[PDB]
Write an enzyme that holds these catalytic residues in place. Structure first.
Site, PDB file in Angstrom:
ATOM      1  N   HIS C 158       0.247   2.256   5.054  1.00 46.89           N
ATOM      2  CA  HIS C 158      -0.441   1.232   4.251  1.00 46.89           C
ATOM      3  C   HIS C 158      -1.869   1.720   3.870  1.00 46.89           C
ATOM      4  CE1 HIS C 158      -2.160  -2.483   2.894  1.00 46.89           C
ATOM      5  NE2 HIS C 158      -3.133  -2.316   3.772  1.00 46.89           N
ATOM      6  N   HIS C 163      -4.529   1.934   0.205  1.00 53.62           N
ATOM      7  CA  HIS C 163      -5.969   1.830  -0.069  1.00 53.62           C
ATOM      8  C   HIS C 163      -6.661   3.031  -0.625  1.00 53.62           C
ATOM      9  CE1 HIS C 163      -6.858  -2.198   1.605  1.00 53.62           C
ATOM     10  NE2 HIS C 163      -6.061  -1.914   2.625  1.00 53.62           N
ATOM     11  N   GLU C 203      -6.485  -6.216  -1.571  1.00 52.04           N
ATOM     12  CA  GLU C 203      -5.174  -6.239  -0.942  1.00 52.04           C
ATOM     13  C   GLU C 203      -4.011  -6.569  -1.880  1.00 52.04           C
ATOM     14  OE1 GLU C 203      -6.232  -5.408   2.607  1.00 52.04           O
ATOM     15  OE2 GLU C 203      -4.266  -4.538   2.331  1.00 52.04           O
ATOM     16  N   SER C 222       1.729  -0.385  -1.035  1.00 53.07           N
ATOM     17  CA  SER C 222       2.350   0.169   0.155  1.00 53.07           C
ATOM     18  C   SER C 222       3.536  -0.736   0.491  1.00 53.07           C
ATOM     19  CB  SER C 222       1.387   0.137   1.360  1.00 53.07           C
ATOM     20  OG  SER C 222       1.043  -1.222   1.607  1.00 53.07           O
TER      21      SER C 222
HETATM   22 FE   LIG Z   1      -4.981  -3.523   3.959  1.00 55.43          FE
END
Ligand SMILES: [Fe+3]
Ligand SMILES: [Fe+3]
Ligand SMILES: [Fe+3]
Ligand SMILES: [Fe+3]
Lengths: 325, 325, 325, 325
Positions: C158, C163, C203, C222
């Site tokens: 993730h 990110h 997010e 992700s």
């Molecule tokens: Fe996160």
């Protein structure tokens, strides 16, 4: 290729059957006399006073008192504050029509705007070009006394009650000049789009203030009936977006079915300049307020030159900061 | 505590036995007539023309041709360029005295400066206050025809040949206004110091250009003999420093024994503003060119307000940069 | 009154039954070993390498290849470009898990961001405080090999696929740090709101590019299934507005029913800072990139100090302008 | 045409009979061991500690106590304050030689400077190139114990007592980096001139503070005898001028007969940048502190890009202004 545009404020000197007084010859002569002042006017001269006849003063008094009754509930705060300033310092009242020269002096000292007597609806490009120098092309004649509540064309009532008060606000004055700055040398297609943005803001714009909807468009502020309808449940109100407004068709006769609401004048100003960024152009213009000239920024050097003015200014703010600690 | 100072250009309306014509009554009346215009003048009015008599025009023609002969070798380049502009667009010539109103229009469009007819040597504070709005208090009468090459007081020859041409240069115009900005509300002691800096720059300053020494001070540029002496081996010339000049004594009658040389007008301007930083004060002022007003910066909010004008400007320069690629 | 907040990057050192591996003891030990690195880590040390076991590398390879298949059609362009840069210079591939220290070096040189190993979901205030110094608190362990396509908590898959790639873009990196800057010393209520804006942008944000809708939120990038659903006809998508997003409830388990679309990262950044303006506070903070410190601006003097840095910079741009003409 | 210059701080990795220890083999081996660290060092690694032998520590203690006795009377205030900070936070004392890695951490947090171990006198261009990234190429070995009061070459005493303390001051640190920024890609002739300006400022500069003359040049601050002589009636002291200093010949062995005095570090910095303006170049460079990179400004677009960073910053200052009212 790039149409001609004024670069000095001096150069602005180079820039119906259904009508309520069409069958009044005394009126049609009053007009020619008044248009006369616009045609003989040159930049820098005091604007000639007009001695309004008692009936003219009477038409003014009706339009004034009637709209004056809606302002507290229907107008944006900038209009109320500017209308109050005009009353306090520019002799606004129901029993006499103000003189353009006194209003211009008032605008010059408040926001740097000034008026110029005009004979009646100017070409779109020339009108926006004038806005670029903070010059508002303004009519000096009054609407026929037979239909005080309604006027096809912009008369002095529409100009002095509809436009002038918003021009006394610092942010709106900059928004108006920005539309004019953006139009300099732009193509005819780009002039029509800008005219349309102008139509939906300066003329018929709505804005939101403390959750409430309010008018700021001159065409609303000088129109009793349209003013009530613009804030009613009848027309559609859309979020202001320069791109969307530029291609919204519109018409002249009846009230507008669609209006655009800006969140704040600073927001609208920001949205108008991002819009101006996307206008196809090999240069940019920047207004020089010391000489009322337009600087054309078309090279690293001309940009550097303006930057220097900006760096001097930042030096002044640094000094103000130590002075207050 | 802080003396009063104008904040709007409107407010400026609130601001000898040995003399060659002391024993001429026709001249002493010409004067009263001319001073008359200064006394009845109000901000914003066209400056009244003066019909100069042939002899007056004759005194002008002598001072003009004589100094005109020294400019190419003794004057700074800003003076030559501005004098050339005045000839091209403001009718400067040896056979007629220019009218203040035409020179003012010329300065407004070039650097934003403007003239105001004055009756004769103003108080130091009022003179510098006027410079703050880019207003040059200017005499309209001519020196007695008996001594054309020498004048005790500043006459129109001294103003129009000595001062005006340098005011047509962007950097010098800003230097002059800066001295006036710095003087607003300053103490009497600080006014005398500023008057002294003014004396050694605007009036009698020298500057260096391509290794050569040149004059820019109006008192030099309108004085045949002083002009030659200022560039000779006789007086002492010191590096310009606002602190040193502010306390240099000086006198009125004979030529100056000491002058200050600046490296460039931008250098002198920078040195004058660091000097203005050290002036004891709880605020700073910034000129608002759109309304010809002085903004007093005495809180985070007023500073923030001006910053916004500066951020708008930087937005314009960013756009100019994409436009030219 | 004002909660404590770090002012130096050094100070960050002071800041289930249903889980797929809950009943795996070999895994629960791998974790403790990995969390170990986060707990013993101090600012400035190279981040310790982790030797991933073949199966760990195998879970990575599945998540990688699967999401890698959606990026060309579902991801914003910033993600594609950053993912490409990571492959070219940071050894991103399906057959090995990247080391945090190599990714951090990559981010430091691209946008000035850096990573810090974290043990697992940090307090909201500490997380946003870290974002203020361009420090991304990053997990180093992998999700249990039994459910490769789904992970309750943020694992290294993730972090490194979701990110990191967006943090390689200049504008997004500044947007993220801005959220952290805004949170410094803010009240708990203001932290929860900011956490919510963060949730709906960093997010799970969507953005519009050339008329098409695209994802940029790490939780989308992700997540195989959420990624497809976020761009489908099922959830509601609203125009991004910091005020509206801050009070949108949301949950953790199932896909999001509502997302916010920004027009451009610069637009969202501008909207986030006007939002930060309205946060109740007696000061502002500005990041000092030379020392990785937070300057608190709470007086005319501290503001003046930062202004000076800005004026130096404008001097550099003026010089660049003459250099290129 | 334009010589190569680093654009990323990573790239710096690509950049006698009379000597008191020439006939000491134990010393000549200590050196090779120490130079070793410089040769194997790569950007980003903690600088390896050196275990100084008691006698080395003894040479340090003599140079330290002796110069320490002159600082209160002979050193500029920036040096005293930085030397005090070093004592408070970086363990400066007479009984132990400080470790480069602890001093570097100290400089990074104070002014963003950092140290890099160097083997001994670098090429002029590489030295100034390093200064451009706020990297000070620093020696790690000590001078032979036989002549503690005198050292031909720069040893760690000269670096840590002479240079480091001034680098802890915000304005001087920027002055040093500016010399390095100006040198990037410059011709060999321009490198020699810049090296000379560097010699007369960073190494042997004098400055005036409250009417008193004081030293700030590292070569003065790490030299007992030169320090006393630089402030005596013997050498000639000239007003600092980058142009004049750049062509002043100078020598290595005996004390300097001529020094330059700056009025203030901000004044010298301003004079150094006007000097850098006149350097023949088709571009300018601007340091990007977030990534320790050099941005080359060679087009309207690259200048626009940096301008945007500056406009973000001005937005932060506007917000700080409302926050404090
Ligand atoms: Fe996160
Ligand atoms: Fe209208
Ligand atoms: Fe004079
Ligand atoms: Fe040295």
């Amino acid at each position: 290729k790039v149409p001609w545009f004024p670069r000095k404020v001096s150069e602005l000197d180079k820039c119906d059957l259904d009508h309520p007084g069409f069958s009044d010859q005394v009126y049609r002569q009053r007009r020619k006399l008044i248009a006369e002042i616009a045609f003989q006017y040159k930049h820098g001269e005091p604007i000639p006073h007009v001695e309004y006849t008692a009936e003219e003063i009477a038409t003014w008094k009706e339009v004034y008192v009637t709209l004056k009754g809606l302002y507290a509930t229907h107008a944006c705060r900038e209009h109320l504050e500017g209308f109050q300033l005009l009353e306090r310092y520019c002799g606004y009242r129901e029993d006499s029509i103000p003189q353009l020269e006194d209003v211009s002096r008032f605008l010059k000292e408040r926001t740097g705007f000034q008026l110029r007597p005009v004979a009646g609806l100017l070409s779109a490009r020339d009108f926006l070009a004038s806005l670029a120098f903070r010059v508002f092309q303004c009519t000096q004649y009054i609407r026929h006394a037979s239909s005080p509540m309604h006027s096809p064309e912009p008369d002095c009532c529409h100009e002095l009650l509809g436009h002038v008060p918003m021009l006394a606000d610092r942010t709106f004055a900059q928004f108006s000049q920005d539309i004019g700055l953006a139009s300099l040398g732009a193509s005819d297609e780009e002039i029509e789009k800008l005219s349309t943005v102008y139509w939906f803001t300066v003329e018929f714009g709505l804005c939101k203030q403390n959750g409430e909807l309010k008018a700021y468009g001159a065409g609303l502020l000088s129109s009793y009936g349209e003013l009530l309808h613009s804030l009613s449940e009848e027309p559609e109100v859309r979020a202001f977006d320069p791109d969307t407004a530029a291609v919204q068709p519109y018409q002249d006769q009846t009230y507008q079915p669609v209006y655009f609401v800006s969140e704040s004048f600073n927001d609208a100003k920001d949205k108008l300049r991002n819009y101006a960024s996307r206008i196809q152009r090999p240069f940019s213009v920047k207004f020089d307020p010391y000489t009322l000239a337009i600087d054309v920024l078309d090279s690293p050097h001309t940009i550097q030159r303006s930057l220097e003015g900006v760096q001097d200014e930042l030096h002044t703010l640094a000094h103000a900061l130590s002075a207050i600690s």
